[PDB]
Design a protein around this ligand. Structure first.
Ligand SMILES: [Zn+2]
Length: 372
């Protein structure tokens, strides 16, 4: 019922489990958010995404501004109504994908100018335009627009990028607050930057806290630094963020990454891996990933995973899915994606339950031992 309320029900070390209440629904944390790129979670109906256990999905802001357009979606009734998802939706600011998928990007203090990677050039993106598009889409959790620092990054380079991003965080905050309808029904998350330097991360955390946000995301990770560095950065960075607000690790999603990130205080995750790898033929299992296309699965009657309770594993065999994927059948992508998302949601439920029971450390340990 509230606009935003985060409650921690249990803790174990730096790990915590709880819930976030929003007008459109309750989000159980730690949470994994399936990625909906072009107003759709690849190959799945919204009801199927909900069926796997998802409480919230992530909407793509760069993609949607290009096709079908933020203004058009708003006219059509908003993203929820457009795609058929009535629960909360977190929208990325668009800044990351602009710098990764756009042609001839132009950085400035005002924002970024770019060329759409597909048809001319839906062009300008600033902190206020980003917040505006996110409002138009009707997202529940709005992300402040930032400048992600590439890996590696020199201290001065990481500093100047972080400094700009903090200036953009203030502008994002003001832009969000000027829109009453948005400020009254949505939440705004700030994004910590600073690369792998803790002094920079500390400065970013303090600026962010000074402005004030509903939740804090840890940005700049999962950009090539490797799990060891990622984890090392998480170790000192997470404690810098307000304890009473959710901590969101953007773009992190390998099963092992999530488990180690939760041990470090992270409450929210998003990644294209489950959906992406599904289309590619990689299925996640408690004993590690398997590539269903491999000949050894040609006559395997067992489900993708023997403990998984998803509809796919209850009704189809590896042999059939192996056939579908090798034949390039759409049902293959549908089945594989549904299982993978189901697998991720089950992993989050096992994480939440073990934290509430005070046995997460053992779970993590047992998980890694079997998964690898
Ligand atoms: Zn399954």
């Amino acid at each position: 019922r509230p606009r935003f309320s985060f409650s921690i029900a249990a803790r174990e070390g730096k790990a915590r489990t709880g819930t976030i209440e929003m007008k459109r629904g309750v989000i159980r944390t730690p949470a994994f958010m399936p990625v909906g790129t072009a107003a759709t979670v690849k190959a799945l109906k919204p009801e199927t995404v909900r069926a796997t256990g998802a409480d919230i999905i992530l909407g793509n802001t760069y993609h949607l501004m290009l096709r079908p357009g933020a203004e058009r979606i708003a006219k059509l009734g908003g993203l929820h109504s457009f795609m058929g998802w009535d629960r909360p939706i977190l929208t990325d600011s668009g800044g990351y994908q602009v710098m990764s998928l756009s042609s001839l990007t132009k950085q400035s203090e005002e924002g970024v100018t770019f060329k759409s990677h597909l048809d001319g050039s839906r062009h300008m993106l600033s902190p206020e335009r980003s917040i505006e598009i996110q409002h138009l889409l009707g997202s529940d959790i709005v992300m402040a627009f930032a400048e992600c620092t590439p890996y590696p990054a020199t201290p001065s380079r990481a500093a100047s990028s972080m400094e700009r991003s903090m200036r953009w965080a203030k502008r994002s905050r003001d832009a969000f607050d000027s829109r009453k309808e948005q400020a009254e029904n949505a939440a705004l998350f700030g994004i910590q930057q600073g690369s792998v330097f803790e002094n920079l991360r500390q400065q970013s955390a303090d600026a962010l806290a000074e402005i004030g946000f509903d939740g804090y995301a840890v940005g700049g990770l999962a950009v090539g630094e490797g799990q060891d560095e990622m984890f090392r950065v998480l170790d000192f960075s997470v404690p810098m963020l307000p304890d009473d607000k959710p901590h969101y690790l953007m773009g992190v999603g390998k099963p092992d990454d999530i488990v180690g990130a939760v041990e470090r205080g992270i409450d929210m995750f998003d990644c294209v891996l489950p959906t992406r790898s599904g289309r590619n033929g990689q299925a996640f299992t408690w004993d590690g990933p398997i590539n269903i296309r491999n000949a050894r699965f040609s006559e395997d009657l067992k489900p993708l995973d023997s403990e998984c309770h998803c509809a796919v594993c209850q009704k189809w065999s590896r042999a059939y899915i192996h056939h579908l994927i090798r034949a390039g059948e759409i049902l293959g992508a549908m089945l594989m994606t549904e299982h993978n998302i189901a697998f991720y949601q089950q992993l989050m439920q096992k994480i939440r339950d073990s934290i509430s029971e005070g046995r997460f450390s053992q779970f993590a340990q047992d998980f890694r031992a079997r998964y690898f």
